[PDB]
Amino acid sequence: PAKDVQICPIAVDTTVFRSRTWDRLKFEIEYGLQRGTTANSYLISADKIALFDPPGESFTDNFVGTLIQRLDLNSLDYVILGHVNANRAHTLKLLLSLAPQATIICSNPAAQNLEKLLADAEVNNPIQVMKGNDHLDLGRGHELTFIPTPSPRYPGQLCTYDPRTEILFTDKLFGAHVCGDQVFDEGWTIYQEDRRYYFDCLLAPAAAQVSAALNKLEAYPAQTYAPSHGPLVRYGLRELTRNYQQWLSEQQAQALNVALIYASAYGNTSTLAQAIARGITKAGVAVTAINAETSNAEEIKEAIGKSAGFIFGSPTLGGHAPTPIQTALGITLANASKTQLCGVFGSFGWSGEAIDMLENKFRDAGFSFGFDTIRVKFKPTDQTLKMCEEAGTDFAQALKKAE
Numbered sequence: 001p002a003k004d005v006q007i008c009p010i011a012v013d014t015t016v017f018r019s020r021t022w023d024r025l026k027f028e029i030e031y032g033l034q035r036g037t038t039a040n041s042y043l044i045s046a047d048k049i050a051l052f053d054p055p056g057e058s059f060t061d062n063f064v065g066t067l068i069q070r071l072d073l074n075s076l077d078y079v080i081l082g083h084v085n086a087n088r089a090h091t092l093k094l095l096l097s098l099a100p101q102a103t104i105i106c107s108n109p110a111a112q113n114l115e116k117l118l119a120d121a122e123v124n125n126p127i128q129v130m131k132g133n134d135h136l137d138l139g140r141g142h143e144l145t146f147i148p149t150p151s152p153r154y155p156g157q158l159c160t161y162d163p164r165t166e167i168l169f170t171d172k173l174f175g176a177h178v179c180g181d182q183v184f185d186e187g188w189t190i191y192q193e194d195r196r197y198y199f200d201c202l203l204a205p206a207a208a209q210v211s212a213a214l215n216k217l218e219a220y221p222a223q224t225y226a227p228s229h230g231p232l233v234r235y236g237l238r239e240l241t242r243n244y245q246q247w248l249s250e251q252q253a254q255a256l257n258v259a260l261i262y263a264s265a266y267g268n269t270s271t272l273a274q275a276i277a278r279g280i281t282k283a284g285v286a287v288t289a290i291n292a293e294t295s296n297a298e299e300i301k302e303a304i305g306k307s308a309g310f311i312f313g314s315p316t317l318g319g320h321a322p323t324p325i326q327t328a329l330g331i332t333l334a335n336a337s338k339t340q341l342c343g344v345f346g347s348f349g350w351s352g353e354a355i356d357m358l359e360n361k362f363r364d365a366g367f368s369f370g371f372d373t374i375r376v377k378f379k380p381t382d383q384t385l386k387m388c389e390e391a392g393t394d395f396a397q398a399l400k401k402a403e
């Protein structure tokens with residue numbers, strides 16, 4: 001059917017707003033099972049009123065339209081962000097015009113990102129940054145605790161625990177891209193494929209960071225996970241968590257590993273990276289995704305230190321690679337043995353010099369390539385993604401053959 005907003009009370013003072021779509025939201029590998037999705041927003045209305053995670057651009061208008069019918073937006077005290085991107089920032093522009101009094105609650109990386117993304121918006125709501133073990137009291141026992149859970153794709157990711165309701169707001173962790181009528185997750189098997197596919201696409205290339213996150217989240221006695229996507233996780237909570245533990249262990253235990261180092265200004269090269277990673281992991285080879293824009297030098301040395309191959313993905317910005325890709329290249333060249341398999345991909349518009357530069361440097365430095373250098377003009381399509389996944393598989397097979 002058409003996009004809607006499903007509203008449901010879920011705990012004391014707590015309501016979920018699920019923006020639902022039965023169609024494919026984006027051309028991203030994670031939407032591949034084509035079972036639709038939801039973007040979940042949450043409202044805690046106590047002595048103070050907090051809204052978690054307004055949905056992105058496809059959902060902006062239905063969401064604001066629905067929300068104003070339920071809430072006087074001038075009474076909104078807080079907008080809490082589990083993560084930040086241009087997609088979400090679009091909704092925030094409208095929402096914060098209507099709720100000029102509200103304070104933004106988010107992680108420090110999310111904050112810098114938001115400040116960038118809203119540089120030319122007129123909105124100037126204040127931001128309160130939260131780090132681990134910070135609190136925010138909404139009254140009536142809802143003393144929230146914050147838990148940064150960063151990953152290469154979501155550097156600003158922030159989880160939130162509400163002890164009054166025993167809900168852990170988990171943002172991108174523990175979700176599933178599936179649109180259904182059930183607000184809650186009764187039944188294990190119907191969601192099992194979606195949950196594993198979600199893990200495989202989003203989390204497997206960030207296994208060390210995701211393990212670290214789950215380690216922190218164990219300290220909170222959650223009875224429910226309230227994720228960005230899919231049903232709320234109540235009936236499948238323990239089972240899903242044990243499966244995560246097992247899947248993470250599998251990932252970090254595979255004999256071969258690929259360092260996939262990328263950057264992306266508008267998301268295109270990132271979309272390609274996800275696809276290539278999935279082709280690699282589905283072939284039984286681990287991926288350590290590195291977002292060069294947010295990573296540090298020791299991160300890269302470490303990744304290159306344990307990898308059997310490395311792959312660079314880069315956009316072209318004024319005819320050059322982004323600065324973080326240039327510096328990552330140096331660390332890589334300074335540390336990688338010439339026996340590592342090499343790959344190059346990227347998206348571009350008018351020109352793709354960054355790709356050419358990287359291919360040349362790696363060839364000159366005597367590396368063997370595991371797939372033909374990938375060049376995508378502007379926005380990736382379904383076909384593009386499948387080709388990239390197949391390249392990742394190809395890369396993986398080439399590594400396995402080498403032992």
Ligand SMILES: [Cl-]
Nearest residue numbers: 083084154156
């Ligand atoms: Cl983020």
